[PDB]
Amino acid sequence: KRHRKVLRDNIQGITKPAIRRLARRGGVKRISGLIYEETRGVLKVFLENVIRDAVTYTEHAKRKTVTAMDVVYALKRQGRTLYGFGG
Amino acid sequence: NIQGITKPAIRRLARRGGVKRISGLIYEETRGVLKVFLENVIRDAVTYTEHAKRKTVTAMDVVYALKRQGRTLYGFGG
Amino acid sequence: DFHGIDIVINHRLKTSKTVPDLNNCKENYEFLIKWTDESHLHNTWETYESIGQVRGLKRLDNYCKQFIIEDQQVRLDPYVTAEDIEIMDMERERRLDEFEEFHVPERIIDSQRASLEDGTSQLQYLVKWRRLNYDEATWENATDIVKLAPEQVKHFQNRENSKILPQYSSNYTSQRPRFEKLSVQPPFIKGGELRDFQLTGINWMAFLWSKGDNGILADEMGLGKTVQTVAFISWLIFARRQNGPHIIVVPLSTMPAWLDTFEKWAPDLNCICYMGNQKSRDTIREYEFYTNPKTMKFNVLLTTYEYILKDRAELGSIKWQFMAVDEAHRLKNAESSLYESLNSFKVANRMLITGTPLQNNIKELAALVNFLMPGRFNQDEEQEEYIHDLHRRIQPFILRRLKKDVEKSLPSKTERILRVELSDVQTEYYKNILTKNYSIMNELKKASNHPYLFDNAEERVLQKFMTRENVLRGLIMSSGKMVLLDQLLTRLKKDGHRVLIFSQMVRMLDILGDYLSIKGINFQRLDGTVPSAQRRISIDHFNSPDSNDFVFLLSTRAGGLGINLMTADTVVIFDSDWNPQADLQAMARAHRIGQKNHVMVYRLVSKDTVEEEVLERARKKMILEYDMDSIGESEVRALYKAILKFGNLKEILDELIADGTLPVKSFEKYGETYDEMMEAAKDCVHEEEKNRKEILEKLEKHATAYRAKLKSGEIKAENQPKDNPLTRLSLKKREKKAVLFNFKGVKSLNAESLLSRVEDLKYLKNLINSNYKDDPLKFSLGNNTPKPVQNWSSNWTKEEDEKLLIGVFKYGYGSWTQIRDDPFLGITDKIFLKKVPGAIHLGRRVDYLLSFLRG
Amino acid sequence: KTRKESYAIYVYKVLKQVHPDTGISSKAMSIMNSFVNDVFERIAGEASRLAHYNKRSTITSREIQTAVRLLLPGELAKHAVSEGTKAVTKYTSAK
Amino acid sequence: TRKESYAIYVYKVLKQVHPDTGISSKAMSIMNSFVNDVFERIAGEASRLAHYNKRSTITSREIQTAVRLLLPGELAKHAVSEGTKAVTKYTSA
Amino acid sequence: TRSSRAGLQFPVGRVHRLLRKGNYAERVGAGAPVYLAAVLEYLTAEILELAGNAARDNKKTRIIPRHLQLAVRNDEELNKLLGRVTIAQGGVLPNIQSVLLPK
Amino acid sequence: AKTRSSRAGLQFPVGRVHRLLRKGNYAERVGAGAPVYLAAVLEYLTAEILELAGNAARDNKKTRIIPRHLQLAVRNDEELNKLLGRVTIAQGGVLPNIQSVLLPK
Amino acid sequence: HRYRPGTVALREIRRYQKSTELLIRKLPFQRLVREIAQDFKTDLRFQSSAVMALQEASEAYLVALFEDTNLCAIHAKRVTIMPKDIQLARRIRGERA
Amino acid sequence: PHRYRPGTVALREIRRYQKSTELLIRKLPFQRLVREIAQDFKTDLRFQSSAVMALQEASEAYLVALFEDTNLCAIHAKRVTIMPKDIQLARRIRGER
DNA sequence: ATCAGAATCCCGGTGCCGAGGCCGCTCAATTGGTCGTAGACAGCTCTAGCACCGCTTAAACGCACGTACGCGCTGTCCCCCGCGTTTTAACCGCCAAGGGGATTACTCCCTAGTCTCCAGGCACGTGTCAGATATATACATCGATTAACGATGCTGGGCATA
DNA sequence: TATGCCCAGCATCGTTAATCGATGTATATATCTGACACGTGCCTGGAGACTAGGGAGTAATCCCCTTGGCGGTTAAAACGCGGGGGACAGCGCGTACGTGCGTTTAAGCGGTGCTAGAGCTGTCTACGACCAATTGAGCGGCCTCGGCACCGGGATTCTGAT
Ligand SMILES: Nc1ncnc2c1ncn2[C@@H]1O[C@H](COP(=O)(O)OP(=O)(O)O)[C@@H](O)[C@H]1O
């Protein structure tokens, strides 16, 4: 064809063997089928809040560029202490 | 005085929790759960009490100890 | 190791409807299947019931399915037209052209004699095929390779005969020799003749090479910059004796072009490049050195830019002395991986062949200065002094030969701009984006000439109803460059010209792929997606004089990547690709020397947009255009073996020294030692005869003295005395000694084998050269039949006697290591080390043949 | 005698503004007092750390604004920003 | 901009137990941000505790009980011993 | 007073002293206690409003802490805001699983 | 001596943490032995952490300390895991914990 | 007569869900907490409201964790609780040291 | 070749992934997805090279721990295959539902 | 389809105690003025990201095959439960009581503020020493080849006898 | 002339010795990189030194908030017995999931046009803290009575077993 390239939604970027490897590190022998579809929703709920807090800290600092310290502050606010990238 | 917590106490706690039928050797370990979850709060109460240069456990130190661990309590000061 | 199905070649019918299913493909059609782990010459027409369960079966199922759909698209469809038949049938001859190239070899990598199951050992060649990667290199016996492509076998033997190993290379690192500026051309250009500025450039590169310095070749694109490099390397190897390995990095797109030009101008030098990924790396490593804990069998190779960064340990562990690079604009910034990577290779001299604009940024010129000379070294007011000193400071280390000296044989040059206005779609897509609706910064610059770049754009223009003419009509009228491009394209089609379209965006190339295909315009794309096996077929198809592809699409970096178009003349550019001189180098792929019907260039300048500011910024960066007489024991023994192998060495001594046996000495010393060895040999034979005859006379006197006592009766007849002059005389007749003499420590040196060797080899040279000089494979003997074999385990006739003297005529006597590996004789399984064909056992037979022909 | 501080006669006004016929016990009164003190502690500490991250020496209205936006779940944050900015606007427009 | 980071103050402690090992940059940031985080936890706990008892200052007892609270036992015992030993060493000298 | 000029009910000078004596920042703002008092007034109006409705659900005049528990646990955003909060003298919602019904 | 770090017999800077207490805005007045005490406690913390990191680097035959050595050095201890409960170390991993019932039997 | 076993527990749930008072007595709990705190530290005095604080505060955990245990039982297609349900809730919540 | 035992290869992948110190989720889909969600939430935004790593490792933190607790829910349920009710029970006991 | 039965809710009556409200009075917020100062504003100096380009090359997925595990169902074992029977101590309230938390006053001490330098610390060029990599040179040990020597075996070219 | 007898003639087999070359092993030298210690240069916060005063340590006082006992009785706690729905051992089984395979696709290693934007040093003005004065609200302490707590009696409401 070589006409158009429609990607639909970008939620399909995380495929099956990715979460298969995540569960492989977690310690799961064999998984099911309709698990990664809900897993993307779990990451969505546990992601829109961190992104929202990052946008809030970014907009509050009189700037329109998300840095790295605001992510550490947003994660530490929700009880997810993360090191390595400052703090 | 671990025998003070009788069976009907854990029974009423089970009905408030929402269980239709319980087992047998459950309150025996439940007293251990309350003991582990209690010795740290009491330890913090003796810590805030002794640090206050006075030997009297008040009510604000309990609220501070519960809010420190992540379980906020209202009513008894705050 | 398994014998499974690899790919599918051809297909036909087996037994001589609406839709044939798989059953009809089983019991009604046979398919040519190519097997894995085997060459393409073993293709057999097999189906499913003839091979059973074999490794790999889904490929033939998918190919047969595409053949079923194809049959549904040939004559089993009421919607097929006329061009679809030429396209679907064109794919047949396309695949045939892509499959017939795998049957002809292209190179012989290695040649190792492997054993079989019957105990015999046959010499098999590591065959490299055409239009294929270094992988899938199967071993083929020497019984059919010489019967199909003898040029590859003869050239493969020429690569081994022409010993150009680095151990013979000179070492002028301590003192450079006397250089002489030549004016004529060396007898190494077998392709064509050269003009004057080519030899001038060669005299400049060799003029600066003798001073231990490096320069930059900054000439015009088309003046033979590649041929000057090959001629400079060949003249440097065969002139200054610099046979060492030389690395020449060439992009992957230009690598086959440099291979064809390299073999067409210098066929005496190999051109084993470096391609592949995994198995081809194992091929280059197994061909690089021998399996031992240092056999350099190469010198000139071609390595891509990505292969350097991917493999730094393999290329970094090898010493180099000369480095050449085409299109050296990649070193624009001194903080790149390639810039620090090329500086890691311990080399001696470098050469930059490019024409990058060294005026827009000082870090480019300075980067090219410290890249080859580590140590050497703003405001507009001080710019006249900075270039007043740096200009003449860099002039002796640069070549600036403009095209004004070569316009006597080139057509005129012209260019016309075209300020194309915007439309309503460009107005709403130019204003409504920076307001509210979206449906960041560079997307406007990309959409400043064509609106079809998002998703909600095709259905917005179509205000009605699948149609075909309305879509193209709404597609051409969306921008002025499409209407004017179609009008100018029609105008050029009314006469007959080859028009090119250079675009930066890769999506616009697909849009043109969907627009030009409906209008019935045959073309082929060229971007950075298809591999070399496809773009090489496309370019080789465009260079045909009867090609129907009058439109050829390119790109920016991929368009101006390399190679050239000779039949193209019209260059249409949609917009400037945000780089000065990038348009000059982009038109340089079509506007060349071979073009005769002039060159017409149209620049579609976008008026009242954002590209004109970038064009002005490109014009702002364009206005700036500123011991020898010592013979040891190993030399006496090695020279003695050279006499036992070649005989007289006063005529081809240059070929007997460069082989690696005779050290670098004076030829007069070899002549004096040869005359002393032959003279002392003849004198030693003369003294051996004068003394031997006297000994025979003494044995005749003592023998007669014994017979005088024997015929009398003083010797008993019961026991014959074995200690008498008669027995020692009979043993003296059958003596087991030779004319020996010690010459300068070396002992055990026969003098008769030297004289008889010069007589036999001289009679062979005069006998062969006096009858067949330019055709040694047609020499005969007539009726001279020697004695038959003495219990040999192989057939031997007169043809073996005629072909046996060819190996002695070419390689010499005693060189049985090359006779058994020579496929031009047929004695593959007739020469071994238990066995009958021995080393000396056959050599004495050759001596009997020579002694039989001399008598 | 110790004069302790508590939000007693400040909540019954808002209570009567929406329910002028209900009451509240002293237990839940202390629950609401400690609740207002707890929210004051969370907003004060959040504005403190947020004022310390940006090297700021003062806490104006935007710090409490983003502290309320980050402390509330959804619509309550928007209503608190509109009502709060309305109160600050009325306080600034007047004396 | 001269940024503040605990760099030379970690080598002097590492060489006293391992004078022959290395350290990466990412793990160095882990140690730096770790000490900063523990400083925020102890300073914050001592601040809120200093505000609870109506205390207008922070001495050594607040850090002592804050250490005894943030640590379950062993680390609190040895931290109190080494801490009081350091305060006694600084006061006596 | 600033509370009457701001048009609110919660105090401004006392909470301002809490911002000064609380030892939080070196300086203080001008409209910070008014904004905070408005937010606390909104939360007070919402909590006391749902507490009044919960009081009317059982025909009771004086609101009990159980009405606060049933008023906070019944909402979604209020339950998300007060997750680890235990109201004094409260209870639980009458939530019984359908799998425990006699069927 | 001159600096308080050398007089106290520690390694962490006493003036740095003191200035952080004067600037962090946590108390109106500071003490006299607070930065030395906190410096000693932090010195013990980094001492034990760097010790278990050294062992976590010697058990796998490694020279430099990687974040995985810190992860495996903290997660293996009970009190360190209790202290760093809601803590996620970057560039680390998890403990190789495989259930006994998951083995093929 | 004989009532169905199980439904009386349900009506006891309906009766206890409306109560707003404690369940465990104050003197056994006072002697337990006073004995544990006495063994932890001698000579200690507590407040009368602290008994209610630790009382209802302990009941909140003994009701939330017990409810999570009940959900762990329902998840396993059973109604009778097991110690592995409490250990599972403590392991998943993360408070299990 | 032959047919290996099903499930043992999974344990081999566990032994191979337990020693890995890098990431598992690819970077380009994560940037294309997170940048799309953040772009739909707020227009005109710019991220940092380190923020992608922080959201990547921080995401895989609860993406691995949540799958560990879910695996515990599958083990307690007398099963070996995870179910959505294990995810729901994990989010229920965790408290972040 | 149904009927007596324990709980459960509503109506009527008693009755109970603590917030609403009143008296007052204490003291921190309110103005008004003065003194100290923080960061908003434009732009200098860069600066990593906005998009893609060249160019791979390992993976995602449809496809086909095997297979096996929890739902469903069968059958059996079991363990608190409704209810009756037999102990049992917490507490409403009262009584004695006692000593440490809170208050006020006296004293005290040490520290943020200020005035006023100086080597610790940050970045980087320079330097010889751990390991690691060849590298010219020498010595010892074969692998294999070729020239040389001891003994012929028919084979070819001629000499004495049928 | 044919057949046994004399005199060469290369290849058959085996054995000795010299030679080119590969393999193994030192042995002092010339790179490679990776430094950790020192001096180069400069920034600046902590320190050398004084102090007034407000929070902090300590003594005498108030009392009231918390401790230790005392009869009665009441709902509350412990045992027990037949048992019936719940938990568990075990088989049928079929559709979803793990296991190979080929092809297209997108993620990854470098480059590359700028360009809106991060940090800050010029500049000062409205923003922010402290000090008199007063004055009106918040809260300490006590009285009223009505919403609600509690019990007796009449509906009432599912509910187990027929
Ligand atoms: N010495 C020569 N004589 C004739 N033609 C030449 C010569 N050198 C180059 N050419 C022409 O130039 C073309 C090759 O272009 P080339 O110079 O290799 O491109 P590049 O700019 O990459 O060096 C060939 O088609 C050939 O016809």
Ligand code: BEF
């Ligand atoms: F100008 Be050349 F074709 F590179």
